[PDB]
Amino acid sequence: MKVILLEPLENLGDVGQVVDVKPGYARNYLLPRGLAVLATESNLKALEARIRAQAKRLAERKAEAERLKEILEN
RNA sequence: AAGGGGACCAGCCUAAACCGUCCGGCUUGUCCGGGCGGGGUCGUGGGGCCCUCGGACCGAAUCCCCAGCCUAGCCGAAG
Ligand SMILES: [Mg+2]
Ligand SMILES: [Mg+2]
Ligand SMILES: [Mg+2]
Ligand SMILES: [Mg+2]
Ligand SMILES: [Mg+2]
Ligand SMILES: [Mg+2]
Ligand SMILES: [Mg+2]
Ligand SMILES: [Mg+2]
Ligand SMILES: [Mg+2]
Ligand SMILES: [Mg+2]
Ligand SMILES: [Mg+2]
Ligand SMILES: [Mg+2]
């Protein structure tokens, strides 16, 4: 069963990663303990859209910095 | 059971795509979710979106009025 990890998990996976676990593990351990969420379409969208926003918010620095770098060094 | 002969006769509304709006969630957005509104309803497949050409007749199973009918009655030939 596919779930999205809200935490890095020892020898399981990394935060934001989509891993495959047994239904029981997810429902009776991972989910209730806030350690993961079901890889449903609705938050696979949410997962992706946050990856996208972060990549955008990163690029805005590397671009804004580089613009600052243009001023300096000259 | 099909088919044939008859009785009756009538076909519609949604869900989803896409759009709008409100509400709240938090993990801040081009986000997810819940309302509601628009859109859409089909098998010669249909619908959405994007271009591109073209801008009155139908009509309820709802509502209103009316006739007609029911719930009392009345006239009615000639020893
Ligand atoms: Mg028959
Ligand atoms: Mg017949
Ligand atoms: Mg008859
Ligand atoms: Mg017919
Ligand atoms: Mg809000
Ligand atoms: Mg939703
Ligand atoms: Mg929405
Ligand atoms: Mg909505
Ligand atoms: Mg088509
Ligand atoms: Mg109707
Ligand atoms: Mg009499
Ligand atoms: Mg008499």
Is A53 (CB) below 7 Å from strand B?
Answer: yes
Spacing, Cα A11 to ligand 8 middle (Å)? 41
Query: Rounded to the nearest 10 degrees, how much is the dihedral formed by the CA atoms of A72, A58, A10, A12?
Result: -140
Please state whether strand B lies within 7 Å of residue A69 at its CB atom. Answer: no
Give the C-alpha separation, A44 to A65, whole Å. 31
Strand B, nucleotides covered by protein (CB < 7 Å): 25, 27-33
Alpha-helical segments (H) within A4-40: 23-25
- Residues whose CB is less than 8 angstroms from the CB of residue A47 and which lie 6 or more positions away in sequence, other chains included: A4, A16, A18
Angle A53-A55-A64 from CA coordinates, rounded to 5°: 105
